């Protein structure tokens, strides 16, 4: 067991790029039961670890069913100071680059360091697994690789629970809600949770194209990224903001991006709500419609 510092320092002196003996760039690391592995400098001219900050737009699901995990990362980015425990800032392609990176996860009641080489699965020189909106940003793809290593393979990330990942990023305690049994004050419970920095997911119980007619997807982890109140036509309306970790496929009901009655909303209020018409996976919906469609709500509470 050599540490990140040690391995990094060594590779720099040797002038060699690191290769992970524990989790090598071959089919063992992909599955337990076809892609070319490439490092980000082999993929593009000017790769970067973090560009314009690490935020939820940098998490876009690829050809692997790990939404449960990605939704949790996206939630984590809403709490930057927690985020930078999981992701060390002092990492770069343009300075002290030795093809090695690391991340931290809460496991067994303590922080543990996962080290990886920066080889990533590609096809036609593009990432097949999770990537960022920005073709040159690689933190999220690398984090996913590190989480895969922690579970033994990329395939091991197929299916899982959002709360598992939330706990692995925070060391917090999971709390579940069946939205049918929801208390009267659950908007308030969720509001206090988001303001306290707690991570929130939700889903529609089951038992890449738009699944439902309303634009939601069944059996799919969504990140809760906002809760707010807007006064519209005299009265105040409770809203919920969600993000689909696909980065695509939004709700189309009231308060959706292209909803016309956004025109009746004040221009400053729009700004406070960060309302944009963009196919980014993120959308506002009414608290009412939210409680009506979603069935499970998962909150990971901190200390
Ligand atoms: Ca970014
Ligand atoms: Ca949107
Ligand atoms: Cl960089």
From Swiss-Prot:
Cellular compartments annotated: Cytoplasm; Nucleus, Nucleolus
Superkingdom, natural source: Eukaryota
UniProt keyword annotations, A-Z: Calcium, Cytoplasm, Disease variant, Hydrolase, Limb-girdle muscular dystrophy, Metal-binding, Nucleus, Protease, Repeat, Thiol protease
Free-text tissue specificity from the UniProt record: Isoform I is skeletal muscle specific.
Calpain catalytic domain residues: 17-303
Positions of the catalytic residues: 67, 220, 244
Any Gene Ontology biological process: protein destabilization
Any GO CC annotation of this UniProt entry: T-tubule
Subunit text: Homodimer; via EF-hand domain 4. Interacts with TTN/titin. Interacts with CMYA5; this interaction, which results in CMYA5 proteolysis, may protect CAPN3 from autolysis. Interacts with SIMC1. Interacts with UTP25; the interaction is required for CAPN3 translocation to the nucleolus.
Disease as annotated in the protein's UniProt record: Muscular dystrophy, limb-girdle, autosomal recessive 1: An autosomal recessive degenerative myopathy characterized by progressive symmetrical atrophy and weakness of the proximal limb muscles and elevated serum creatine kinase. The symptoms usually begin during the first two decades of life, and the disease gradually worsens, often resulting in loss of walking ability 10 or 20 years after onset.
Entry's family note: Belongs to the peptidase C2 family.
Function in brief: Calcium-regulated non-lysosomal thiol-protease. Proteolytically cleaves CTBP1 at 'His-409'. Mediates, with UTP25, the proteasome-independent degradation of p53/TP53.
Protein name: Calpain-3
Organism, scientific name: Homo sapiens
Full-protein positions shown: 58 to 417 of 821
């Amino acid at each position: 067991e050599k540490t990140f510092e040690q391995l990094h320092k060594k590779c720099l002196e040797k002038k060699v790029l690191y290769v992970d003996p524990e989790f090598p760039p071959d089919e063992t690391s992909l599955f337990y039961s076809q892609f070319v592995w490439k490092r980000p400098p082999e993929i593009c001219e000017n790769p970067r670890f973090i560009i314009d900050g690490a935020n939820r737009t940098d998490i876009c699901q690829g050809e692997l069913g790990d939404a449960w995990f990605l939704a949790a990362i996206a939630c984590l980015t809403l709490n930057q100071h927690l985020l930078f425990r999981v992701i060390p800032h002092d990492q770069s392609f343009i300075e002290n680059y030795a093809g090695i990176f690391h991340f931290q996860f809460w496991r067994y009641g303590e922080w543990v360091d996962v080290v990886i080489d920066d080889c990533l699965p590609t096809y036609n020189n593009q990432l097949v697994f999770t990537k960022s909106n920005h073709r040159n940003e690689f933190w999220s793809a690398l984090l996913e690789k590190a989480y895969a290593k922690l579970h033994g393979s990329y395939e091991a990330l197929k299916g899982g629970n959002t709360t598992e990942a939330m706990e692995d990023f925070t060391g917090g305690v999971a709390e579940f809600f069946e939205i049918r049994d929801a208390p009267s004050d659950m908007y308030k419970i969720m509001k206090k949770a988001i303001e306290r920095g707690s991570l929130m997911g939700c889903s529609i119980d089951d038992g890449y194209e738009t699944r439902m007619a309303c634009g939601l997807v069944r059996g799919h982890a969504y990140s809760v990224t906002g809760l707010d109140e807007v006064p519209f036509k005299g009265e105040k309306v409770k809203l919920v903001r969600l993000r689909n970790p696909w980065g695509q496929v939004e709700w189309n009901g009231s308060w959706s991006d292209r909803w016309k009655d956004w025109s009746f909303v004040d221009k400053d209020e729009k700004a406070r709500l960060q309302h944009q018409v963009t196919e980014d996976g993120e959308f506002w919906m009414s608290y009412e419609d939210f409680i009506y469609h979603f069935t499970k709500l998962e909150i990971c509470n901190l200390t």
